[model samples]
Target chain A: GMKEIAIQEKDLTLQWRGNTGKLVKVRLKNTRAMEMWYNKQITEENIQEITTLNIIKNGKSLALEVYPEKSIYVKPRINVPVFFIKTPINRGVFEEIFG
Target chain B: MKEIAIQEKDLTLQWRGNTGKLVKVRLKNTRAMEMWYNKQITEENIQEITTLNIIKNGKSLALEVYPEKSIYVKPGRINVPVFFIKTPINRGVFEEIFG
Candidate 1:
């Protein structure tokens, strides 16, 4: 039983890698705050004491970064694009090159 | 009366400061795309071309740039935090440091 549980946590790393650049739109079924207690590594002694881990909710957002960036935000859920087109360059040039 | 005309082109620049993290996200709309092409100079009869102006249905999708570890994707039609979290950093540790 414990071995099977360990297998699950190990897969988290793999899942994180796969979500890169993909839109992460979901309603988290688990409230990580409570889950932290029963969660493998989290000890019952410090479960509720860890208020920092309590900040999370369900919403639609984008995974606009890769494995290296390490930028995941919750609570204030909004998908802000990493790239932007500004003045000087103009739109014509955008199409000619990217189009 | 001729309203607008132009040369059409766009280029990509690597992130420079806070904006230019190795990985990034970019978003654009139909109007931005049009504006990009409308302004012109040097006598251009509106150079016509097709490009990634916006989602016709205003749908959002995932975009990645693994090589540069960057990306430019259309965000959900809402202004969310442009910030992102790096991979593997769980919620508990994330809020502890950042929050």
Candidate 2:
């Protein structure tokens, strides 16, 4: 179980960067499906240019997207507030949760 | 159970005119922590490295890691040797897995 990670542009540094969203396991039959949701819904960014993006070329910014949930309204860092369909938790995790 | 993740600083890479033929990795253990020496790499060489910090010195490196879709390591970096790995489960994550 692991929770939110604060990632930025270029070279996706998948880790907790003080983005206290919450923790969830999110074990789906297909992790790639999550990847799909991430790409299609979350952000169309690839694993590259994610700044492990200490910096990059395509030059993007770091932040989470705000989504509408059925029962909850999530928190946002900069321009959006986040909401999830409900999940699990642990401590400091690296990747994103795909539901 | 699943394997553990690694710290960022514990990863060490080598090449010919590059990092070297070795990609030294260290895992956090109950006592002194485990160590492994590698050549290019494999799934075995990359057990549970999901969120592990795969950087060295100050140069944040990229992964051509197999489990992560196996990207090519910036070309000439690992042209010398194949990646050798070691893990705690299965047969072994031992030192002599290769040499």
Candidate 3:
């Protein structure tokens, strides 16, 4: 649903600043899959990102890696335009359309 | 819901330390707004909030303003209490984002 870039340099660095993309929601009954997708795919910077960033590390940027003690959530400010692969929108066609 | 303090101070002096208050939840459907308060945060400065902000695109909620430009989710962490808001998204060109 959205694309996020993480850049790290030091302690006061920026991991996610630009590209505040669109809203995305993936509904799955499996909490295991949700956990996997949330951690490895959407949250990971290496494998599943649409744009790979180049970090300029020094001593003032935030690290681009996830830590055990930290809880991370991506909040994008810029809205990105996107189109999905056309999946089921649940129930009737009326509910499928976005207001 | 929960209450938030909007504090303003002179930038010259270092800001004073402030203990973070509690968080609340408010929902808005077709009818009037409804607020849900956490039973634990029954202390001073933790007043019940009365704001109803709905973000359609995000599928999440925020504790900012009415029809808030962003959505938020709480971090169930023990000490570090934070409410993160994603960029504003809503229905129609009429629903806009403001400070």
Candidate 4:
């Protein structure tokens, strides 16, 4: 086990293991919005636009969606305050590679 | 175990891992050009193009990469020589509830 990271103002990066186990990084303006996201205050319609990312697309914003378990949300940076999902490692090929 | 085709015959996946946790593998070869995701790329015949970067993330592995250049060949397409690196994830937080 590792010492978990504390959600705080200085922690300006949001990260997670994607469905394919790919490491995803989202840079935030600051931890203010992140705090709200982690607390579930942010929703799909209320997602804030992350203007800094150049890889996804232009005007791509971060929103929050309920992925049944809050473990995995879909699309354009849904600020669902999700970090990782603890699913069993041997699922489908895609799931196993990415998840 | 499963294999993923990042490219066509240029790149293919083999298998490596314990009995159950099969890792997506790649073979060693050099092609005049290659494809990734959906991009066609050309390689240079200079110094060997391979190296690794190590960083600290909860004792996890991190990579720092930079490409010489990239160009969009057409709509929703690109061209570049890409190298694949493996990153292991080990951190984050999330929220969940509701239907």
Candidate 5:
């Protein structure tokens, strides 16, 4: 079932797409060799990862993107609103499961 | 501290990576959950991971433990492999305490 396996082998993409000034990117890079941070702001464009949205201002769009292979790792922040865009690395694997 | 370690009876939780498409055994007792997850799903083996505000203890956000995919199988012959996609309702508290 390469398909199911394919779906299973993908990565995690976190995203943030909110207003203009409502987002603060906190990247966790020094720990466990995993380095990551959210974008400075969440617009309308979009992304494929974990996003913790902080605030908001009349926004336009976001240009969020996560490679088909990398998983977004953010350092744990406090009381931040989690506006997760759920990473989608589904390079075609769901059908593989029915096999 | 409500007894330092959260008891299983008080909370309900299941740790999962971004993709819950993989077929992991659900040893009703729990060990089966790990046998396969450790092989790849959680190969990085992060013992401590910070979950969103959906789940909290000492603070608003805290690190949750990974079962490490235990391999103990006692009974539950009627069990089956299952999917572990995370739909975190982060609205609960659970812990591990062993002697």
Candidate 6:
């Protein structure tokens, strides 16, 4: 159903209100579709797409925006973390690996 | 040389981008760390544990790893797709905010 899909397609938003000197670590949900798509683009076809969202910081509020991609009709269920270290890029992990 | 004690801990990585798909994955003993001679913790002494996690139960060959700071995901001389986003717990978004 479209309603279910809509529910599944909800985007993720994280707010970091910590001190400017502290570095924060973030975790993302990885689905099967994402794994397959990433591999196809990176390993098989060798293509790298957008991987990070915009980080907007205004005054004291720092907002991290994450626009998750859509899954197939089957509905992926696998969940895992995908990133390792701190990158200056909004999300350059994929770029570093594939590139 | 002082022993760099590396501990293991559960970690997660997640991301989303232009593809409009969700990526989720879980990991263990992923976080990296170290101990100093004086038992003082500094950014230089603390090591962020990270490695490549490959998807084995997927149709496509998905790759997971960290990326360089301050870069975007684009094509490159090599071929790989890293889907992990690393955040330093001690550091903040000073550069992103200032820039």
Give the best candidate by DockQ: 6
- What's the TM for model 5? 0.18
Query: What is the C-alpha lDDT profile of model 6 across A1-99, one tens digit per residue?
Result: 111111111222222324232123333324434664555422222211223333322222222222223211222254323212133323333222322
RMSD of each: 18.1, 17.3, 18.7, 15.4, 16.4, 19.1
- Model 1 chain A is weakest, by summed lDDT over 10 consecutive residues, at A1-10
The lDDT values for all models are: 0.25, 0.28, 0.26, 0.30, 0.26, 0.28
What digit string (tens of lDDT, one per residue) describes model 5 on residues B2-91? 102222233223333312222222323343344344442232432222221222333333233233332232334422222222323221
Per-residue alpha-carbon lDDT of model 4 for B1-99, expressed as tens digits? Answer: 112223233422222322222123232234322344323233332113232232122232222222222122221233333334343321111011100
The candidate that achieves the highest TM-score relative to the unseen native structure: 4
Candidate 3 lDDT: 0.26
Docking class of 4: incorrect
Task: Write model 2 residue lDDT over B27-89, tens digit each, in one string.
Answer: 222211123233223334444343222333343323333334322222122221122332212
List residue ranges in candidate 2 displaced over 4 A.
A1-67, A70-80, A85-99, B1-82, B89-99
The TM-score, computed over Cα atoms with residue i paired to residue i, of candidate 6 is 0.17
**Chain B, candidate 4: TM?**
0.21
lDDT of 3 by residue, B1-99 (tens): 554432111001111111111122222221111112343222232234333233444332333433232232232222211223223332221122221
Q: In candidate 4, list every pair of residues with a backbone clash.
A: A19-A98, A19-A99, A20-A97, A20-A98, A20-A99, A21-A98, A21-A99, A63-A78, A63-A79, A83-B93
Please state the error at residue A1 of candidate 2 in Å.
33
Candidate 1 lDDT over B1-99, as tens digits, reads: 122211112222223231223222232344335433554211122212212221223332222222222232442352211112122232223223322
What TM-score does the first chain of candidate 3 have? 0.18
Cα distance off (Å), candidate 5, residue B25: 14
Off by over 4 Å in 6: A1-23, A30-76, A84-99, B1-99
Candidate 5 local lDDT, A16-89, one digit each (tens): 12211112232222321222224432212322232222221123222222231233333343212123222332
lDDT of prediction 1: 0.25
Tens-place lDDT per residue, model 6, B10-92, is 22334333112224333322121212223332334322323332332222222323433212122223211222433221123
CAPRI quality level assigned to candidate 2 from its DockQ score: incorrect
